[PDB]
Amino acid sequence: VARIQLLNNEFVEFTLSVESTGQESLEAVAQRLELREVTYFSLWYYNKQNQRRWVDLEKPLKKQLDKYALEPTVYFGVVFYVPSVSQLQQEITRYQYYLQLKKDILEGSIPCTLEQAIQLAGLAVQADFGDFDQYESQDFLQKFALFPVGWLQDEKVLEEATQKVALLHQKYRGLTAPDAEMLYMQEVERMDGYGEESYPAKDSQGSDISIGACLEGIFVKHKNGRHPVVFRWHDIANMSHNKSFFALELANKEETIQFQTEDMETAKYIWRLCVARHKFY
Ligand SMILES: [Cl-]
Known part of the structure; x- marks a missing residue:
């Protein structure tokens, strides 16, 4: 038996089979709420390092919670933030x-x-x-x-x-x-930080960075005192991951920019979410 925490500090218990996907649990929440515009919302859990991770809606939910979650609780929430x-x-x-x-x-x-x-x-x-x-x-x-x-x-x-x-x-x-x-x-x-999620990483020259997704595209922040760089969604031709690295392929000069994340599992996750956000925007 697992738990879905809702946005208003209530929860729903549910039996998790081996095959039921994350999408199937999301659709059940949507029927419960009579929510008809489900595309903006998904489910997340706290991973074993207490970091928030959006569910892979395509895959069976139970393996995801067994392998990566501390407890079998997911949270209903907005995964695709809308500019207006x-x-x-x-x-x-x-x-x-x-x-x-x-x-x-x-x-x-x-x-x-x-x-x-x-x-x-x-x-x-x-x-x-x-x-x-x-x-x-x-x-x-x-x-x-x-x-x-x-x-x-x-x-x-x-x-x-x-x-x-x-x-x-x-x-x-x-x-x-x-x-x-x-x-x-x-x-x-209109407040700074609205719609933003970010992750620690390093750039190709070893400097520590925060990288993530915002309404406008993929942003990178350095800790010098300067200003963040945003790679706008349409200036991004493709994205990729290999080992611990997450990469952007830019449209302008086909230049590929690498970022080193904590591990291989994190790079794949960041890749999966950033690809999904690119598709949404
Ligand atoms: Cl997603």
């Missing part, structure tokens, strides 16, 4: 996407100042609880996750910010939940 949530057509799709974006914020995976957090929390509170005066006090706000890694904030800062959220909340009276969610996602959309 307005391209999501249906309310159920937007709501799931909203839950993911709120998660990205509350976990700190999209960095966020406290003032940005207060503005986002005001919209989330309107979306999640509706108009402020249905609740004869806002003392319930004190016991909810409102802010990124909020439990680590000083109590006085936390009290003050929660009071600001309560006041922002009153200003949003009359906003429906779909509209409040869209306004929330529209803000998160």
Whole structure:
């Protein structure tokens, strides 16, 4: 018996056969949610080094969890981030996407100042609880996750910010939940780090780098103080892996750029996800 953790802090148990693929589990989650735009979403697990890894949806799920996972839990989530949530057509799709974006914020995976957090929390509170005066006090706000890694904030800062959220909340009276969610996602959309996943590596000259995927293409960051380089999706002719190396074949001069990742299994994984993102964009 395995577990699928959903985007709203609920879970589903399920019996894992030997042959059932990751795709089959994803489709079952989608039927459960009545989600009709499933292409943006997939399933991930924590690997044996506690790193997040998206499931190979083509392969049987159970072998993947046995071989690479610490425990038989997968997480439902957005694997293909969209430049504009307005391209999501249906309310159920937007709501799931909203839950993911709120998660990205509350976990700190999209960095966020406290003032940005207060503005986002005001919209989330309107979306999640509706108009402020249905609740004869806002003392319930004190016991909810409102802010990124909020439990680590000083109590006085936390009290003050929660009071600001309560006041922002009153200003949003009359906003429906779909509209409040869209306004929330529209803000998160424009924040640095939205849609980004990255991995440690070295470039062909031994320097340490972070490499990964963003909306625009494959990015590389060095730790000097300069600026990241982005290989735009359409400037990328092909991608490959061999041993621990992951490679981009660029369209301009057929130049091939190598990157050395932690091991051969990591290079294959990075390759698989980056190929899939290239195809999606
Ligand atoms: Cl994928």
